[PDB]
Amino acid sequence: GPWFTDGELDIEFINSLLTIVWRFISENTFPNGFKNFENGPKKNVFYAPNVKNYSTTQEILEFITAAQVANVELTPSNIRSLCEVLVYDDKLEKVTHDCYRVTLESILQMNEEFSIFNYFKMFPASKHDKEVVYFDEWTI
């Protein structure tokens, strides 16, 4: 595809393209993209199950064509591959072939009882703390 620049991938273009695709799908699936999540925990709404909140591949291709960010033609295989890259990151999920929907965890990641999934909210331990648990330990 067009990702190869001088024989290697251009990670900045990858990040920008993935971010704009994820934002488009986030605007599709939620009632208002990144609007209800402001003042989120008290007042946030979601779509009814009968609502087709999923965004198909054709809509994403049309949006990225009209956005003029890619600057080249995009085969549906290419947008499908980068959306597979997104679903590998757990940013979104696939419910039907050529259909995707943004997961709520990716929305919460941009900004109580302990959970492993909200690990970004946790703060690192202060220095000179002896009783700190390391994942690399027992293997080093």
Partner: protein, 568 residues
């Protein structure tokens, strides 16, 4: 600068890295709660398997028969040692003592158990039942098993005795306290072997059935008898007695009650599923799922099927039979299916459900149905539909998803999100090459190589070498990558056990180092007056020691929330 091997052996955990996590954890817990004698006995039983009293005497230096018998009594009362009495052909009878993870996990989960008991029965309204529930559960866990009459013999107030009896009945009704018996002290494998041999002998000799037919019939009879024996604790046979005065249900006086670990692990699994659902479907829908799981929790399937510990999985047909039986019991149990009308009565006053849904781009049944349909239509199988409007939790299909999600997010938190991406990429298409990874997962090749090299060290990615020469040289062969779930899950379970054990070891070392100051501070006259009766330096040392101990226990709780998923 350079660090000497003296400094490495002193300030690091190199000496503890060579210990098995099971033995290290069990010995540390027993040495922390009980003494060093019980720690030696438990460690020797873990290292050598089942042992007799004579073997324990001859294997441990510094202990005689009476000391070993006394510490075995102490361990057996707290249910840390299982036993089996067997008779040889010559007629000699010998008792062989095992170790059971149930009692050690009870010691490990004790404060979590007390908190779950306090929170679960909705005594959050006021204070006196908070005191009584906490004290009775703490006494039950500390003494292993106690009778209600012996507990009430220490109370002189009639109203207090009545409230304690009512609270004991309330605990017994909802499955948290059960009747202790010899079933909780005999091994599962030995019980199944006894049942299978008994049902094998009862088959008449010179039968028309072949050997395999006899084995199958014996297995069926052993399975139904084993199911009856296992479920016999949960039939509420200790509560049927009514008091001499009418209109009061009481627990039997002479029965011995014990804490039920399976119900507590069911509650922990429910909490894990609620936490998983909080990251996929909203917060109000998370509350609805929470209420649904709390309602269908006592009758939910057990965390581990005991028949899986009987060595019966060597037959593939037995594995399929166990899977089908699990799928059947998670669905056709009468108390597991639920409707919106059933959940309508259990919703709290604060929960609203009014404006939580938009249909187009007061605890009513339709809103609950919409929330449960959102739960059922999610990518994760939180709920499934048997018939339309009836919902049940798919415990057979939801728990590998929970394990995979927890494992992937732990890797994301430790090794980075790129590690999550690479692991899920290798998982989605099962066997891949480096170029296929680079094409499918869009990131730099050197980053791919470094990330998979890091992931290989933790059993996350296994290298499959395909040789292209007569000798399997690494230069000419091609290396593909696959992701085996079981190896990685077992490795991380062992790692979390080692981390928990090392944390407990550090806490015990700190307490042993500051023992004099902690003994001075914990005295009856000193306590409550630490500022007046202690020097400022000793006060600051006590400050640091107690803060470090609280941090140790908090990290232990957080590890336990992260480790029980792989014990499911």
């Amino acid at each position: 600068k350079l660090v000497t091997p003296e400094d490495v052996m002193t300030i690091s955990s190199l000496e503890q890295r060579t210990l098995n996590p099971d033995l290290f954890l069990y010995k540390e817990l027993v040495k922390a709660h009980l003494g060093e004698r019980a720690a030696s006995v438990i460690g020797m039983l873990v290292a050598l398997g089942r042992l007799s009293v004579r073997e324990l005497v001859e294997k441990i230096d510094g202990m005689d028969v009476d000391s070993v018998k006394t510490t075995l009594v102490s361990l057996t009362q707290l249910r840390c040692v299982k036993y089996l009495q067997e008779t040889a052909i010559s007629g000699k009878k010998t008792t062989y003592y095992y170790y059971n993870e149930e009692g050690i996990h009870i010691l490990l989960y004790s404060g979590l158990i007390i908190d779950e008991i306090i929170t679960q029965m909705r005594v959050n309204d006021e204070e006196e039942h908070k005191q009584l529930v906490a004290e009775i559960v703490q006494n039950v866990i500390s003494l292993g098993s106690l009778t209600v009459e012996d507990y009430l013999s220490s109370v002189t107030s009639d109203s207090m005795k009545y409230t304690i009896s009512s609270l004991f009945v309330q605990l017994c009704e909802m499955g948290y306290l059960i009747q202790i018996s010899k079933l909780h002290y005999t091994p599962i494998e030995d019980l199944w072997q006894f049942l299978y041999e008994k049902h094998y002998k009862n088959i008449p000799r010179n039968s028309p059935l072949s050997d395999l037919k006899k084995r199958s019939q014996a297995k069926m009879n052993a399975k139904t008898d084993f199911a009856k024996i296992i479920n016999k604790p949960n039939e509420l046979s200790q509560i049927l007695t009514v008091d001499p005065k009418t209109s009061l249900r009481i627990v039997k006086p002479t029965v011995s009650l014990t804490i039920n670990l399976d119900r507590f692990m069911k509650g922990r699994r429910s909490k894990q599923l609620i936490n998983l659902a909080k990251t996929r479907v909203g917060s109000v829908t998370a509350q609805v799922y929470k209420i649904a799981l709390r309602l269908t929790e006592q009758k939910s399937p057990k965390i581990r099927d005991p028949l899986t510990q009987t060595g019966l999985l060597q037959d593939l047909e037995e594995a399929k039979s166990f899977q089908d039986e699990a799928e059947l019991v998670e669905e056709k149990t009468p108390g597991l299916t639920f409707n919106a009308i059933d959940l309508a009565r259990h919703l709290p006053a604060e929960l609203d459900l009014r404006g939580s849904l938009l249909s187009r781009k007061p605890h009513s049944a339709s809103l609950i149905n919409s929330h449960l349909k959102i739960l059922a239509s999610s990518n994760f199988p939180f709920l499934n539909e048997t018939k339309p409007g009836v919902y049940y939790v798919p415990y057979s299909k939801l728990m590998p998803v929970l394990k995979s999600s927890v494992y992937e997010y732990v890797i994301a938190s430790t090794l980075g999100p790129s590690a999550m991406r690479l692991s899920r990429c290798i998982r989605d298409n099962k066997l891949v090459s480096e170029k296929i990874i680079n094409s499918t997962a869009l990131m730099k090749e050197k980053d791919i190589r470094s990330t998979l090299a890091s992931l290989i060290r933790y059993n996350s990615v296994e290298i499959q070498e395909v040789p292209r020469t007569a000798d399997r040289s690494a230069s000419r062969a091609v290396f593909l990558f696959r992701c085996k779930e079981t190896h990685s899950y077992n490795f991380m379970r062992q790692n979390l056990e080692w981390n928990m054990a090392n944390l407990l070891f550090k806490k015990e070392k700190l307490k042993q180092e500051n023992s004099t100051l902690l003994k001075k501070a914990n005295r009856d006259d000193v306590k409550g007056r630490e500022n007046e009766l202690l020097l400022p330096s000793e006060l600051n040392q006590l400050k640091m020691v107690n803060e470090r101990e609280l941090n140790v226990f908090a990290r232990l709780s957080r590890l336990l929330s992260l480790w029980e998923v792989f014990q499911m």
